[PDB]
Amino acid sequence: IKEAIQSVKYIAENMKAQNEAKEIQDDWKYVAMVIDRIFLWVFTLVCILGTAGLFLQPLM
Amino acid sequence: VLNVHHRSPSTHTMAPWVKRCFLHKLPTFLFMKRRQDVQEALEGVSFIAQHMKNDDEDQSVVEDWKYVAMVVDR
Amino acid sequence: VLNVHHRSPSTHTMAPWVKRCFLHKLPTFLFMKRRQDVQEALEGVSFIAQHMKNDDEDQSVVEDWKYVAMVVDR
Amino acid sequence: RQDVQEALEGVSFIAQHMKNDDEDQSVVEDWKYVAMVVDR
Amino acid sequence: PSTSLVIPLIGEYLLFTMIFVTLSIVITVFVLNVHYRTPTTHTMPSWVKTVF
Ligand SMILES: CCCCCCCCC
Numbered sequence: 001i002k003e004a005i006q007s008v009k010y011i012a013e014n015m016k017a018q019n020e021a022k023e024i025q026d027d028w029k030y031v032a033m034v035i036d037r038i039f040l041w042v043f044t045l046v047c048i049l050g051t052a053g054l055f056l057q058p059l060m
Numbered sequence: 061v062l063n064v065h066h067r068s069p070s071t072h073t074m075a076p077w078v079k080r081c082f083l084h085k086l087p088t089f090l091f092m093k094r095r096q097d098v099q100e101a102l103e104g105v106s107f108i109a110q111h112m113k114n115d116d117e118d119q120s121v122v123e124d125w126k127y128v129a130m131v132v133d134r
Numbered sequence: 135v136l137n138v139h140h141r142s143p144s145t146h147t148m149a150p151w152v153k154r155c156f157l158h159k160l161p162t163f164l165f166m167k168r169r170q171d172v173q174e175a176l177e178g179v180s181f182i183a184q185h186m187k188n189d190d191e192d193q194s195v196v197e198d199w200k201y202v203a204m205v206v207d208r
Numbered sequence: 209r210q211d212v213q214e215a216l217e218g219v220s221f222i223a224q225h226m227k228n229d230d231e232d233q234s235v236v237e238d239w240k241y242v243a244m245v246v247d248r
Numbered sequence: 249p250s251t252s253l254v255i256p257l258i259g260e261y262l263l264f265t266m267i268f269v270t271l272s273i274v275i276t277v278f279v280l281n282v283h284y285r286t287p288t289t290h291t292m293p294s295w296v297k298t299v300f
Contacts, residue, residue, distance in 0.1 A: 021288075028283070035282060043272065050268075054257065058257060
């Protein structure tokens with residue numbers, strides 16, 4: 001009788017713990033997305049600067 | 061078009077222009093057409109219901125992102 | 135090292151030597167550091183809770199296999 | 209009383225659903241083990 | 249030819265692009281290691297909460 005109510009309490013605590021772990025995993029994914037974006041901008045600027053200064057500019 | 065497939069509500073947020081453009085105009089244009097112990101128990105069951113409703117909302121938004129990627133692909 | 139990552143609790147048994155070697159000593163050596171209608175409803179809720187407990191145990195064992203793979207990799 | 213009756217049917221349906229799900233998981237683990245034996 | 253006096257601009261461009269694409273794969277293996285990471289195997293630091 002009380003065992004079923006304690007089991008529902010256990011189910012609620014398990015779902016809360018799984019939700020908190022998924023929050024931590026979303027934070028780990030978001031920091032990787034941030035590193036991905038900063039290196040996208042850095043290598044886009046380096047690629048345009050290299051193809052300008054090394055390929056077209058002396059060759060004109 | 062592969063990047064807009066894996067967008068989730070925990071990372072991105074769907075802008076209203078990509079709400080209203082890639083779901084209504086172009087799918088119709090490209091032929092897509094879509095006592096004290098008892099008290100804690102009610103609190104736990106209400107928490108379970110809130111969690112399942114939030115999970116269904118997030119799944120609906122990620123299915124929306126998948127359909128947007130499908131429309132851009134076509 | 136990719137075979138030991140995909141070892142499940144249902145098909146393999148973790149031996150005590152990999153327990154004592156690849157879980158305790160080497161993660162410190164390599165700087166890792168980790169009423170007949172009513173009565174069946176209660177029995178059903180008890181079965182659901184016990185099955186979620188078994189699922190949590192098997193998930194812990196498969197994450198332990200993943201950590202052993204990570205230690206061998208480093 | 210009519211509102212009380214459907215919740216017990218819901219709990220029994222959830223129990224039967226999870227039992228069928230566990231049987232399907234056991235059968236697919238059996239298929240995985242057959243693949244493992246043939247590979248070895 | 250194999251004249252070592254001066255280097256061509258196109259060979260310099262090929263070497264440049266190979267160096268930066270190799271640095272791109274050594275970055276992308278790091279971001280794949282950062283992505284697939286769980287709280288049951290790693291603890292998240294404090295300075296990464298403010299910077300990244
Ligand atoms: C009291 C019924 C709870 C049912 C929980 C089911 C959870 C499915 C993820």
